[PDB]
mmCIF file of C-alpha atoms and ligand atoms in Angstrom:
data_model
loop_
_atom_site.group_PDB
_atom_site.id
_atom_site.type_symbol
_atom_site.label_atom_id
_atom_site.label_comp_id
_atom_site.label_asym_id
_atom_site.label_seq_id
_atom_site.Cartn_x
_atom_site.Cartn_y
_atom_site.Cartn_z
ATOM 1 C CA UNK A 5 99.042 46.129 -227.554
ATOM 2 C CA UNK A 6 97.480 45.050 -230.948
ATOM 3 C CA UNK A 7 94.157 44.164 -228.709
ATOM 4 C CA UNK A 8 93.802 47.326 -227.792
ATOM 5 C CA UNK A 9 94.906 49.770 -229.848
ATOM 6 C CA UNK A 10 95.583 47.057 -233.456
ATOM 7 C CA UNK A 11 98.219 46.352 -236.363
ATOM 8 C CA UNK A 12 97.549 50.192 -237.917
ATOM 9 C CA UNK A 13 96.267 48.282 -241.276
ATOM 10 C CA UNK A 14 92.284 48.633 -239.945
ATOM 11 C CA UNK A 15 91.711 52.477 -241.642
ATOM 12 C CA UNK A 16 94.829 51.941 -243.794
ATOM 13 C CA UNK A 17 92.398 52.120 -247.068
ATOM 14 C CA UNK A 18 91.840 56.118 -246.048
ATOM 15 C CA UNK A 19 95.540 56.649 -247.835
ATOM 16 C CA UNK B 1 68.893 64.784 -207.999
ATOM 17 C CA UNK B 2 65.627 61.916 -209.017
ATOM 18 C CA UNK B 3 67.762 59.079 -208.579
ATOM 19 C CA UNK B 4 67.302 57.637 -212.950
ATOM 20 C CA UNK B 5 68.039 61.192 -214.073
ATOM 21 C CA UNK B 6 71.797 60.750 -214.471
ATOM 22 C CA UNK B 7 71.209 57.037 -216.160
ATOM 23 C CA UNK B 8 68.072 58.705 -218.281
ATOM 24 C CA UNK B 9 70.365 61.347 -219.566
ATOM 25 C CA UNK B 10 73.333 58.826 -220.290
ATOM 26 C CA UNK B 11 70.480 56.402 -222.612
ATOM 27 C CA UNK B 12 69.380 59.009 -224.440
ATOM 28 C CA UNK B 13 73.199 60.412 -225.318
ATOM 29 C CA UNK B 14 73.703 56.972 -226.809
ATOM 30 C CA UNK B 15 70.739 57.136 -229.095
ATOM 31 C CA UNK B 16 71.333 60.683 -230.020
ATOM 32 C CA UNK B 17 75.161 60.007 -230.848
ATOM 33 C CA UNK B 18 73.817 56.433 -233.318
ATOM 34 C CA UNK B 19 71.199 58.781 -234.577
ATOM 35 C CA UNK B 20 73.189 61.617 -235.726
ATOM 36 C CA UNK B 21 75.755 58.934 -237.022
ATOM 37 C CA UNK B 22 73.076 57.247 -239.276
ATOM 38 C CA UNK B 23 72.453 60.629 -240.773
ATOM 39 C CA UNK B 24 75.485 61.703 -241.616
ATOM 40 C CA UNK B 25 76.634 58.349 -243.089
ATOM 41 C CA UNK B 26 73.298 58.459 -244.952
ATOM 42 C CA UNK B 27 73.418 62.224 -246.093
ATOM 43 C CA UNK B 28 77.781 61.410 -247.430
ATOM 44 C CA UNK B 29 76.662 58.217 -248.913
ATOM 45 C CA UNK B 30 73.964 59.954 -251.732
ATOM 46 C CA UNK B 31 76.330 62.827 -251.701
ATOM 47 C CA UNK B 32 74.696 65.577 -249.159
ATOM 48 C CA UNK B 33 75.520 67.712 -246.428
ATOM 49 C CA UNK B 34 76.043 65.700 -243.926
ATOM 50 C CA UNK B 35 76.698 68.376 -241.220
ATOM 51 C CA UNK B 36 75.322 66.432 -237.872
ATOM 52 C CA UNK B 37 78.241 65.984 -235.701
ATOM 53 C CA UNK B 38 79.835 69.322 -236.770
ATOM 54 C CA UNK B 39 76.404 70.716 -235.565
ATOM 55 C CA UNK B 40 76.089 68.888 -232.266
ATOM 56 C CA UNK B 41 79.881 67.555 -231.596
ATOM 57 C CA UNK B 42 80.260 70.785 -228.950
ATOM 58 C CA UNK B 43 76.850 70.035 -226.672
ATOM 59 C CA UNK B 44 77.693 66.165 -227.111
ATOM 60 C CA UNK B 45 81.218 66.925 -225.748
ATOM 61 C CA UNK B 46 79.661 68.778 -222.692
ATOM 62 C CA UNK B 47 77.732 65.906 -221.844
ATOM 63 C CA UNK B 48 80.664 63.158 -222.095
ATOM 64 C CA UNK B 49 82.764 65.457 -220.414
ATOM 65 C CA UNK B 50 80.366 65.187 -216.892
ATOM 66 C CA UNK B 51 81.968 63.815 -214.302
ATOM 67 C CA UNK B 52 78.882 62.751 -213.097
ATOM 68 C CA UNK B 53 77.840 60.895 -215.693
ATOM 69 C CA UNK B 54 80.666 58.824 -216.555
ATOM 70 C CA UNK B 55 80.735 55.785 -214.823
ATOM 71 C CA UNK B 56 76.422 55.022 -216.613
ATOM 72 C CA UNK B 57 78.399 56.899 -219.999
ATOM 73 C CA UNK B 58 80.915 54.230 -220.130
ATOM 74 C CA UNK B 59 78.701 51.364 -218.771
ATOM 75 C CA UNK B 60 76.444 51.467 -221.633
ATOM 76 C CA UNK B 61 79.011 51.540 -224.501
ATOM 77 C CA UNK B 62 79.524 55.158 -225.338
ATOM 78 C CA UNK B 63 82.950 54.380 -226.615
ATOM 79 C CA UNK B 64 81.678 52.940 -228.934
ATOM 80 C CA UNK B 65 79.566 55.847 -230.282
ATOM 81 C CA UNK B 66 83.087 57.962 -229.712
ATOM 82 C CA UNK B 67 85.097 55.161 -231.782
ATOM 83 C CA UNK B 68 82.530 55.688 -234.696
ATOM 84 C CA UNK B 69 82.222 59.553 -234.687
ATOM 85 C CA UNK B 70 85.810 59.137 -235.123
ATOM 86 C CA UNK B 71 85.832 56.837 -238.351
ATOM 87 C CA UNK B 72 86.104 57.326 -241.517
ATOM 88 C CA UNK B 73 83.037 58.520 -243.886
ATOM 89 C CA UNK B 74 81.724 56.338 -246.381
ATOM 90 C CA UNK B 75 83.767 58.108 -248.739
ATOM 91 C CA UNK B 76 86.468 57.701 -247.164
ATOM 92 C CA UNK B 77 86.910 61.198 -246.113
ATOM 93 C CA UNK B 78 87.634 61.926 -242.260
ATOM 94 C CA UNK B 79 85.574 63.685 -239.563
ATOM 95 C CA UNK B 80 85.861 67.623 -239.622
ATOM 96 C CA UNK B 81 88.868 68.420 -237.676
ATOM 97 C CA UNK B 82 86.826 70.143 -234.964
ATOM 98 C CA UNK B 83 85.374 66.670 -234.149
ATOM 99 C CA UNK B 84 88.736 65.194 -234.278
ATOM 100 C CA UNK B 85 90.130 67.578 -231.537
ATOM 101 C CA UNK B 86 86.853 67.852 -229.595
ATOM 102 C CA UNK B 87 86.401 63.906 -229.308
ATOM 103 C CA UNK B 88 90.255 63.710 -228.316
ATOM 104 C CA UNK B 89 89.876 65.854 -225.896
ATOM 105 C CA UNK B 90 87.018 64.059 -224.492
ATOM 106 C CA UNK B 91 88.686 61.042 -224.405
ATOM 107 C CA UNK B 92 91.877 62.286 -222.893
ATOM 108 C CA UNK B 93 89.209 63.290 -219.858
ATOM 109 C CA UNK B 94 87.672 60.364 -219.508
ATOM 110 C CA UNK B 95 89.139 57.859 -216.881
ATOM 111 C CA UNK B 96 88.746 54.838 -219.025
ATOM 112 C CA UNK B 97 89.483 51.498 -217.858
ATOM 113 C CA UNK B 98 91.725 48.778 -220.262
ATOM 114 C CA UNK B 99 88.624 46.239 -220.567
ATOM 115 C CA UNK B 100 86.566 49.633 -221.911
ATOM 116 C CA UNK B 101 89.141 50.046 -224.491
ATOM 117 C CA UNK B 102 89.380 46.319 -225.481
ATOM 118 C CA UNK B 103 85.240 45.915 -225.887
ATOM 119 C CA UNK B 104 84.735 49.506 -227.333
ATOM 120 C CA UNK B 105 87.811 49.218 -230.525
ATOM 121 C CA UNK B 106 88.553 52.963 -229.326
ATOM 122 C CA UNK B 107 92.007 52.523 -229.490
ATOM 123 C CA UNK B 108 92.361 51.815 -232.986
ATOM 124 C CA UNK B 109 91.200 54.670 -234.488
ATOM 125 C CA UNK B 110 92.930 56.660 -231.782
ATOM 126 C CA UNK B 111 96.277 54.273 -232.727
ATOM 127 C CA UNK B 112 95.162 55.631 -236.665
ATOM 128 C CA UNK B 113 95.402 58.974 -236.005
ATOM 129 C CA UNK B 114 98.736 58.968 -234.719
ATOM 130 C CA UNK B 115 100.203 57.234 -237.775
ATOM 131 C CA UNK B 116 98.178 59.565 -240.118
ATOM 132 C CA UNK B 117 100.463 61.072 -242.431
ATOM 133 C CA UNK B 118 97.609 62.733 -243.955
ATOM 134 C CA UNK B 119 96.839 64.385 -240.286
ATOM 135 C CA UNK B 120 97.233 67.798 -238.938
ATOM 136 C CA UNK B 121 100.490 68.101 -236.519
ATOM 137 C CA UNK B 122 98.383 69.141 -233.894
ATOM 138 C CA UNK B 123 95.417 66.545 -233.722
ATOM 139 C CA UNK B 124 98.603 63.761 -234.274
ATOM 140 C CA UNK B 125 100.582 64.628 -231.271
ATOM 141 C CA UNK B 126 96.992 64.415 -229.238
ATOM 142 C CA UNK B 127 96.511 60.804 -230.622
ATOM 143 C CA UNK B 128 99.863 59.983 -229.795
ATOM 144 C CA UNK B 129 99.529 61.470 -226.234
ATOM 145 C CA UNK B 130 96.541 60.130 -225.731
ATOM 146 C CA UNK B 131 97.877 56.430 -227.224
ATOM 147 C CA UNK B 132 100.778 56.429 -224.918
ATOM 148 C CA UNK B 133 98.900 57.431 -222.159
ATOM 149 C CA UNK B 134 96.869 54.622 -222.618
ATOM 150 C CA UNK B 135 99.613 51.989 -222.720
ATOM 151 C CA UNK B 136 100.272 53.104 -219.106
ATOM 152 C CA UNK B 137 97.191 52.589 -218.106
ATOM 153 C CA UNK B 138 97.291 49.030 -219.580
ATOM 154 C CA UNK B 139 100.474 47.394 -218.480
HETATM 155 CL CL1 CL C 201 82.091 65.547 -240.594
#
């Protein structure tokens, strides 16, 4: 899943 | 059809979409309009929309011109929101195969925009659509 789509911490720094 | 048209047409979508990008990035970073892909996100979508053309699109990496017209701006601003929903929908067309996904880092920006508090309802419940549509598609 993370492969693909990642943790959700890579844009994280936008908030 | 001349038989290179369709591959011809695909190149020079992939250069236009890293050109524009350049700009824009360029244009935000010293603080200027940087108006590019609100300008030409509509015509672009036409042309990654064509069923014709998607098979050379995706061959040559467009997803990965789609992932970064999708990204955040240098200052850390997002896209205009007409981009977001344009390039959603475009995406949500495409018949994209898992390996696409895995080399192009699509997904994660698409996987951002779902979690976005920040995000309009609207382009959130696309991402998430278009996230759990892809999970079927994987497993
Ligand atoms: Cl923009």
């Amino acid at each position: 899943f993370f492969e693909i789509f990642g943790t959700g911490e890579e844009y994280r720094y936008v908030l | 059809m001349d038989p290179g048209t369709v591959l011809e047409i695909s190149r020079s979508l992939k250069k236009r979409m890293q050109d524009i990008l350049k700009k824009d990035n360029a244009n935000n970073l010293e603080g200027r309009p940087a108006t590019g892909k609100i300008e030409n996100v509509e015509e672009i979508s036409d042309i990654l929309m064509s069923k014709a053309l998607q098979e050379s699109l995706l061959d040559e990496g467009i997803l990965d011109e789609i992932k970064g017209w999708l990204e955040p701006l240098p200052d850390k601003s997002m896209p205009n929101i007409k981009i977001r929903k344009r390039l959603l929908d475009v995406l949500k067309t495409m018949k994209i195969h898992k390996e696409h996904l895995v080399t192009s880092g699509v997904g994660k920006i698409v996987y951002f925009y779902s979690i976005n508090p920040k995000e309009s309802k609207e382009v959130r419940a696309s991402a998430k659509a278009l996230v759990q549509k892809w999970t079927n598609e994987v497993f």
